[PDB]
């Protein structure tokens, strides 16, 4: 959802 984090 949030660039891999």
């Amino acid at each position: 959802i949030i660039x891999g984090s």
Partner: antibody
Amino acid sequence: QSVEESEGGLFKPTDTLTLTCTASGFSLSGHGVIWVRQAPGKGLEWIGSAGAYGRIYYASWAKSRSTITRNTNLNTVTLKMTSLTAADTATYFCARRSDVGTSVGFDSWGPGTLVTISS
Amino acid sequence: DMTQTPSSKSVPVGDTVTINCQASESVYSNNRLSWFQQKPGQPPKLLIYLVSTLASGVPSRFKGSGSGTQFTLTISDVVCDDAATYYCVGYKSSTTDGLAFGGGTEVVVKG
């Protein structure tokens, strides 16, 4: 340290549009890469994105007939689109994002490649 | 979505122009918002990222602000070189339709 879109050209409605974002002087790995396009007399339109850490995400209009693929051996990101129509005639751009922390701070842009879908 | 008003604006040389961008919902952390400049025949150019931070080489007469879902680009001391279409881009998540482009604001510089 730049990206460039591969050759566009003339495509039939039954063709597959394949465009490659190639890098020179830096790596696309671990960096966001976006595909956008601009039809004549229209605003920029997002197609989809390769996330820095491996997720691929699309505009809903593109998701049903597009695939974006990373190749970390050849240092490219490729856009493949099918079921082509006149609405896909456009300039296609890719861009690289230096810092994941900006999310959409896409700072390295290709020159754009010209695509025409014929009958 | 990002809703950009107006779709076009004319501004005399030396004056200040403002471009508006309303996000349909909050962008991530209320700050994943960039502004781009695109001149016809050229690719977009990054102007501002994270609401207010200038990209390299961009002069400080370009200013970005934001509050809630509202974002504004201000260009002061406008010169003819500022003629372009300006876009905001907002990001919420790395998902389908998770980012959006505004419709653009064409700025015509009046000499």
